[PDB]
Subunit: 261 residues, 4 copies
């Protein structure tokens, strides 16, 4: 009501607010996921947990998650421009707990589009830019795999021209049991660098209307390669477990404060 | 000396950019049938290719593909086996047999581009986007009545084509221009100072059920007056479906001798 | 000294701090610029000036600025990886004043790399992602222009697959007079969206060791196209003035608060 | 029917992806001379091309180019007239005359890639980065003693080559492998079930002063054992310079009849 200067949910500010790079939440997501469960060094994982987050009930449980998404705002406007509403993503997830409640920590994430990257920082998800590839199921022809026993699906991440992660799943059966780390709240750290010479906050992403397709599960394989530094390398798999292929949706509304310390 | 199906030659032949056919394709298509000026279409038909039984029938075709060679090796590297594509198709005939001519095509990966020229398909490079059906959540459309699917092509940073389909029913009737042989012109520029009309030989052609509904198509400036001549006079039905084929090689229609 | 959780100048946090996407300033920049001075609707320009910034001494003075940069941190480490240390940029600049002192406001900017984009938001420069092309001078052969009378240089910006801006300069003489809008402080608005249900600050970017090559100046041409919305379109040229081609360097240290309101 | 120097054919010929030669090039080069296993190099030489007077001499060449046709039209669209390139060169001879063979090349734009195959230059697609000299500020090197310049190539998301040069002096001596004719193999895959050895004809070859100093070069895995066979045994001098030429067409060295 009072406002004088230019406005907007985000930069760039403009007289009408229409120029802003980001739209206010809620945002809807619909995606396809290729995920591998793995065993991480629990002491290594612990060092990525900020104060307030404790080790998971199974401290060594981790996951590598490839996904391709479509997203839109409440009005659905972005959906008519597929170039604007799609992105690929790779995440690491670590098991943790907040006040006794299972959650996941995402210490590393990459995406291949700028809007999702910046929107990640708004939520505290530490998204960087990368090149991200993922197999898609086919239903006709021979050039791919079906969502059926024996179907194989692969994921790859490169960053700055170097291969960082490769994952594979060969599915053998369908279940109605969502993978644990993809079915708990994510606990992020909101912090942004200080330009004029920071107060981090631990937040949970608030979601609704979480939906999974049937889950196709089988063997998993996962390989980390050099090219992201030793801090990242500490989270490489000790052992690799089951892989999972499924579709996922949710609505993301905003943050809930877990601790402002 | 060094060998290979294609450049670069190498001692074992492994370095070649392209592998020998056959190649398998599995793709997701968003296609719009439209009416083109028949006189404009005729001017894109080389000798031997005559106007369709329906000279004005054309189509704009967006697709996303996975492909592989006979051994399937490319499938394990999604970054190497995937590409997006936009094509124009024109109805024509050769010796009384219905076919389609592709006067323009764009892809977003180099191997499929070069492989296109091998077959005579006139692929250039572009930026190509296409809606994907969803089955969970709210951020997209289902393959079901009322589902909408969009396609866009930009070239050299300029928007060139936008298409949309809103489906209303499923059928087992493949879109006509996507179910006839393609007749290409095999020609490569002379570097040291002879075109052939060929058809792509395919097998194991497979369609999913075809979701069909309204179609919409717009051409924008940015590719020149020759291309603009093929802009729609009227836009017909749209179709969303999956498609597979195996592509084996070429068959000579004419070498003009 | 006390720190427990993972750390870093920016996300992602890590045990050593090495994983952070951004490095602390200062950052050094060395670039090549193709710039066109133009006349903007002063009333339109005014609406992009937040409280505290007044219209420029010449309220209708604006510029369109294409640049290609190399950048590095104090240790110079980024320079050995050209893919990491280079980016292209397009900016709009508007003339304004703070407490009587000439400055420039950048209402819109685009870059083609993720690190520079995020670093822009840290400073309040409203960078989005785009495709940005710019001619470079040649010194041998025929496939280009020399930095000499008659030399022509072009710039183009596309965003989401649509052409947004095209500029051209044909130079006819060399001067030692830096273009006014490229030789004054930039006044940005620091603001980041609030995730847990904003306090903007007006800041100036503090720079040192500003250096210009000889300036090649001549006719300018500039065209805006649709595809960024009516707020942006309000800043299209009424008339187009001189163009300038030159090399530029500076060291960027941090922000100085102009007003926290 | 429709015409054109290259596909796609069109009624006026304007749609063609490629324009007829001559084409002008102006580029900035970062090059490292190195020693290759002569036996490995020999295996990449087709019949008619014999080992160099110095069989082990090779070079790794990074360049950034602007190009245009005779009318200069492409120059006004920087996005259409610019590309980056990485090449391997091997010393060889044809009928006693020194030449260079390019067994591998990569570029980052589609037109130059296709145009390469027209000439017989075995270009593939890659991601190619190269340092640029600066003249103001601190974020780079000057073309002056102690200046360092780096090059990198990735293909399909894997790093393949890194090179570096630290210059110490200026000379008027063009690097040998960048100052001899290139001998290519013109061949295109048969689609309906005959290579030629050709040289690229150039004129108006121009070098800036050559800044020369130490060179460093590393190959990484990621392209196969054939390519790996050309990895350096030893690395020599590096050179940073500007280069221009006009490329007119091909001259037949042999058609093997
Ligand atoms: C980034 C984060 C989304 C939300 N959940 C994900 N796995 N990715 C964004 O908002 O685009
Ligand atoms: C290019 C051509 C393919 C075959 N049919 C198409 N619609 N695209 C290629 O071989 O990759
Ligand atoms: C973004 C901003 C730089 C600083 N000045 C510019 N003109 N661009 C960044 O820090 O990379
Ligand atoms: C590819 C080949 C050019 C000519 N000489 C080079 N080093 N690259 C093209 O024609 O664009």
């Amino acid at each position: 009501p009072g406002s004088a200067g230019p406005v907007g949910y985000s930069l760039p500010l403009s007289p009408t607010g229409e120029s802003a790079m980001l739209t206010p939440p809620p945002w809807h997501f619909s995606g396809e996921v290729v995920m591998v469960d793995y065993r991480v060094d629990p002491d290594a994982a612990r060092r990525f947990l900020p104060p307030g987050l404790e080790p998971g009930a199974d401290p060594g449980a981790a996951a590598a998650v490839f996904a391709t998404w479509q997203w839109c705002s409440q009005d659905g406007a972005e959906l008519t421009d597929p170039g604007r509403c799609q992105f690929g993503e790779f995440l690491i997830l670590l098991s943790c707990e907040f006040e006794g409640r299972p959650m996941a920590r995402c210490p590393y994430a990459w995406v291949d589009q700028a809007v999702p990257m910046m929107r990640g920082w708004v939520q505290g998800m530490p998204k960087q830019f990368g090149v991200i590839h993922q197999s898609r199921p086919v239903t006709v022809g021979k050039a791919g795999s079906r969502l059926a026993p024996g179907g194989r699906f692969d994921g790859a991440l490169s960053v700055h021209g170097r291969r960082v992660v490769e994952a594979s799943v060969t599915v053998d059966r369908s279940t109605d049991q969502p993978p644990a780390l993809h079915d708990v709240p994510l606990a992020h750290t909101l912090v942004f660098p200080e330009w004029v010479p920071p107060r981090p906050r631990l937040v949970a992403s608030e979601v609704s209307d979480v939906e999974f397709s049937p889950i196709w599960t089988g063997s998993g394989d996962l390989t980390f390669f050099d090219g992201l530094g030793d801090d990242f390398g500490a989270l490489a798999p000790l052992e690799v477990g089951s892989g999972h292929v499924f579709s996922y949706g949710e609505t993301l509304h905003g943050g809930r404060l877990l601790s402002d310390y």
